Structure formats: C-alpha cells, structure tokens
Design an enzyme around this catalytic site. Structure first.
Site, PDB file in Angstrom:
ATOM      1  N   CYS A 274       4.126 -19.635  51.894  1.00 31.14           N
ATOM      2  CA  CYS A 274       4.259 -18.545  52.869  1.00 31.14           C
ATOM      3  C   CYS A 274       5.514 -17.687  52.730  1.00 31.14           C
ATOM      4  O   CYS A 274       5.405 -16.497  52.431  1.00 31.14           O
ATOM      5  CB  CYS A 274       4.136 -19.009  54.325  1.00 31.14           C
ATOM      6  SG  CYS A 274       2.578 -19.862  54.671  1.00 31.14           S
ATOM      7  N   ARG A 275       6.694 -18.317  52.847  1.00 26.39           N
ATOM      8  CA  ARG A 275       7.979 -17.619  52.832  1.00 26.39           C
ATOM      9  C   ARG A 275       8.531 -17.147  51.486  1.00 26.39           C
ATOM     10  O   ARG A 275       8.845 -15.956  51.302  1.00 26.39           O
ATOM     11  CB  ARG A 275       9.045 -18.347  53.693  1.00 26.39           C
ATOM     12  CG  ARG A 275       8.683 -18.385  55.192  1.00 26.39           C
ATOM     13  CD  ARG A 275       9.491 -19.426  55.974  1.00 26.39           C
ATOM     14  NE  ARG A 275       9.217 -20.777  55.494  1.00 26.39           N
ATOM     15  CZ  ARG A 275       9.887 -21.888  55.834  1.00 26.39           C
ATOM     16  NH1 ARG A 275      10.914 -21.828  56.701  1.00 26.39           N
ATOM     17  NH2 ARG A 275       9.527 -23.076  55.291  1.00 26.39           N
ATOM     18  N   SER A 276       8.703 -18.075  50.556  1.00 26.63           N
ATOM     19  CA  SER A 276       9.350 -17.779  49.290  1.00 26.63           C
ATOM     20  C   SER A 276       8.594 -16.815  48.383  1.00 26.63           C
ATOM     21  O   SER A 276       9.210 -16.028  47.704  1.00 26.63           O
ATOM     22  CB  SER A 276       9.910 -18.993  48.565  1.00 26.63           C
ATOM     23  OG  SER A 276       8.868 -19.938  48.421  1.00 26.63           O
TER      24      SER A 276
ATOM     25  N   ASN B  17       6.380 -23.194  49.386  1.00 30.95           N
ATOM     26  CA  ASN B  17       6.185 -22.142  48.397  1.00 30.95           C
ATOM     27  C   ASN B  17       4.796 -21.488  48.544  1.00 30.95           C
ATOM     28  O   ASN B  17       4.154 -21.147  47.553  1.00 30.95           O
ATOM     29  CB  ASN B  17       6.482 -22.607  46.949  1.00 30.95           C
ATOM     30  CG  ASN B  17       6.532 -21.510  45.868  1.00 30.95           C
ATOM     31  OD1 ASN B  17       6.172 -21.759  44.691  1.00 30.95           O
ATOM     32  ND2 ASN B  17       7.070 -20.330  46.187  1.00 30.95           N
TER      33      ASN B  17
ATOM     34  N   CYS C 282      11.288 -22.417  49.603  1.00 31.82           N
ATOM     35  CA  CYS C 282      10.834 -22.816  50.927  1.00 31.82           C
ATOM     36  C   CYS C 282      10.221 -24.213  50.846  1.00 31.82           C
ATOM     37  O   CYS C 282      10.286 -24.903  49.819  1.00 31.82           O
ATOM     38  CB  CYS C 282       9.974 -21.866  51.761  1.00 31.82           C
ATOM     39  SG  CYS C 282       8.403 -21.486  50.928  1.00 31.82           S
TER      40      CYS C 282
ATOM     41  N   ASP D 275       9.256 -20.803  59.594  1.00 31.21           N
ATOM     42  CA  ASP D 275       7.977 -21.107  58.976  1.00 31.21           C
ATOM     43  C   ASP D 275       6.862 -20.463  59.769  1.00 31.21           C
ATOM     44  O   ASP D 275       6.618 -20.827  60.901  1.00 31.21           O
ATOM     45  CB  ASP D 275       7.766 -22.614  59.026  1.00 31.21           C
ATOM     46  CG  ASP D 275       6.533 -23.037  58.294  1.00 31.21           C
ATOM     47  OD1 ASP D 275       6.422 -24.185  57.917  1.00 31.21           O
ATOM     48  OD2 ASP D 275       5.643 -22.085  58.074  1.00 31.21           O
TER      49      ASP D 275
END
Length: 157
Positions: free
Chosen positions: A17-19, A15, A12, A129
């Site tokens: 929140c998402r990944s 690195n 993301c 995001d």
C-alpha cells in the site's frame, strides 16, 4: 549532463500500500526533474507475507488519479539492502524499529534509515497504514508522500 548515482529504498510493512505509492511518486519527481539517470529507486517490505503480489488496487487507482503508474511486485527487504542503498525511508516507527534491528546483523551497514515523515514540512511524522481504510485514506497517503518526497529530494539532490 553529469553527476553521481544516489539510491533510495522506500519501506513499509507489506510493500503493497504505502511504499509502492512513495516509490512511484518519487520516480515521477525525478523523471520530471530530468535526473532519473542519477537515481536508483526501489520499494520493499519488512514482512515476507505479500511477496510477489501487485500493489493494492486502491493504491493503483489512487496513483492513476494523479497520472502515475506502477509495475511493482512486492519484495522483502534483505541484508544487502543495507549496504547498497544510500537511504532507507520508512513509513512508521514499527518499520523503523524493525529495520534498525535488522541492520545490526549488518557489519558494514551504510544506509541511513529514517522515517519518510521526518521530511514533512507539515510535520506529520507517521504515514499511517491505509489497508483497512478507504479511498480517501489512500489519497492522504499520496499527499503526504508527495510532500515528503519533494522535501527529501531538495535536500539530497
């Protein structure tokens, strides 16, 4: 109990929140399927702005809600990532344009780079995001990652 070793890097922008959510979901799947020994899993960022940081506390508490934990520290994607991982799965098109750009600087690029959402049986291509969002946004990211990660696994397992 034997096979081959496969690897996947979730990516993301930050690195944070998402990944780390995708990564943690993925480890849980693989662990639940007793195939952890055959996988190398990691997560990384396009950006260097958050390196060394822990995941957003909202991502942490969302995973906890689902019984999952993480100890990840943000790190940047590097040139070697492109030659060492089988798959690079990213969240959105910006990430995707970014990685492809970088991979070009890579001679023997062997990673397949693709949107994680491309595996979504529901077809939501983009994993948005959630940084400026609230807890429900994180929860929807978790939900998407679960779908996408189970689908990816079923096809490369």
């Amino acid at each position: 109990a034997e096979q081959v070793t496969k690897s996947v890097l979730f990516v993301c922008l930050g690195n944070i929140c998402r990944s780390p959510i995708a990564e943690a979901v993925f480890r849980k799947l693989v662990t639940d399927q007793n195939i952890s020994d055959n996988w190398v899993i990691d997560s990384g960022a396009v950006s260097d702005w958050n390196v060394g940081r822990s995941p957003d506390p909202r991502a942490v508490s969302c995973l906890r809600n689902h019984g999952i934990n993480t100890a990840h520290k943000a790190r940047q994607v590097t040139k070697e990532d492109f030659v060492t991982f089988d798959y690079i799965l990213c969240m959105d098109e910006s990430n995707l344009r970014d990685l492809n750009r970088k991979s070009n600087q890579v001679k023997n690029c062997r990673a397949k780079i693709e949107l994680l959402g491309s595996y979504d049986p529901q077809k939501q291509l983009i994993i948005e995001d959630p940084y400026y969002g609230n807890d429900a946004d994180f929860e929807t990211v978790y939900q998407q990652c679960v779908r996408c990660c189970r689908a990816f696994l079923e096809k490369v397992r």
